[PDB]
Structure 1
């Protein structure tokens, strides 16, 4: 199963600030705010010039840990993106961004991607009516992604979609805070996303 384990440490190792949590990774806490250096005993000693490998390695690690997906799945997706027409880099990002868990996270139904995963898993999320509980489900353009009628009363879902009143949403999405509905308009492009990722490096990492 997916990672599990201290998260605001991957942030530290990856250097960049990954938002593997909600509210907190905004508070003046998310370690990168306190000790923005890798975990462990030698976290503070000088860093040696990374090898081309290290570079490509880390970049992938980063992009991947953001969507908290395994290496297996992450890899398969990549190979698919690689096989389709059109710039692999963008395409790959598009597919990762089409995961149900991600879209639920994108619509604000969940505070973090992890939380989004659990929402989907416990059938609190619905896709065009029928409920889906596969965090890996691929949302296509046109799909309406709502909260479970039954679940619409869950304190958490209330609290969340409440804070959503006001907040905007990705130009490839549309949220109806009203009926707790959301709609997948189109595949986000690389320009739409603002990930601290150098997709060129990830593509290269798999070249080797």
Structure 2
């Protein structure tokens, strides 16, 4: 697993899979990937940078190249003409990184049981998750349709909850509150 080094950097401006404030500002100030005045190789490299920074930043590219599946999946609607109106184009290529959402960590992140995929992996490793009633400690566990997975309420609360201040910090805020009330 890649060590977390400069994930929330403002200069590089890469959107990560986290609820962090700095990631929020990166997502805010980014105005899309600029493919103007770039050759094909440069366009591909920029796209790879961005898409990998978001999807599966913690997988060595050697492993991601094996996990990558060249076959994309799609579903066809049989009542397209019957319903009527205009028909939209299927975004096939958005399924490029669809092989990663069957993992347990990404499952937790999507279910909003953790603030980030990294925290989901830590939860799994420390052993606060179960799949079909089995304590799974391996983030790379791949789910199947119909499976069920659960997380400890305390860990989910910590992920989707504010930080618990230290005693001295809380005293400082309470002193300020006292002054305001008076």
| Shorter-chain TM-score range | 0.5 to 0.7
**Cross-structure match for 2:108:** 104
- 3-state SS of paired residue (2:8): coil
> Mind listing any 5+ residue stretches in structure 1 that lack a counterpart?
38-47, 164-208
Is the radius of gyration larger for structure 1 or structure 2? 2
1:141 to 1:12, Cα distance in 2 relative to 1, 3 A: farther
Instruction: Give the CA deviation at 1:159.
Output: 3.6
> Mind listing any 5+ residue stretches in structure 2 that lack a counterpart?
75-91, 163-182
1:108 to 1:76, Cα distance in 2 relative to 1, 3 A: same
1:23-77 Cα deviation digits (max 9, x unpaired): 42466xx35657x69xxxxxxxxxx933311211121222222222221221111
- Note the 1:167-206 alignment, pairs <5 A: none
**Cross-structure match for 1:72:** 62
* Equivalent of residue 19 in structure 2, options 16, 22, 44: 22
Question: Which structure would you say has the larger RCO, counting Cα contacts within 8 Å and 6 or more residues apart?
Answer: 1
Contact 1:8–1:20 (8 Å) recurs in 2: no
TM-score, normalised by the number of residues in structure 1: 0.55
Contact 1:127–1:146 (8 Å) recurs in 2: yes
TM-score, normalised by the number of residues in structure 2: 0.62
- 3-state SS of paired residue (2:130): strand
- Measured on the aligned residues, the alpha-carbon RMSD in Å equals 3.3
CA–CA separation in structure 2 for the residues paired with 1:75 and 1:112: 23
Contact 1:64–1:74 (8 Å) recurs in 2: no
**Number of aligned residues:** 140
1:137 to 1:118, Cα distance in 2 relative to 1, 3 A: same
Q: Which runs of 4+ in 1 moved over 6 A?
A: none
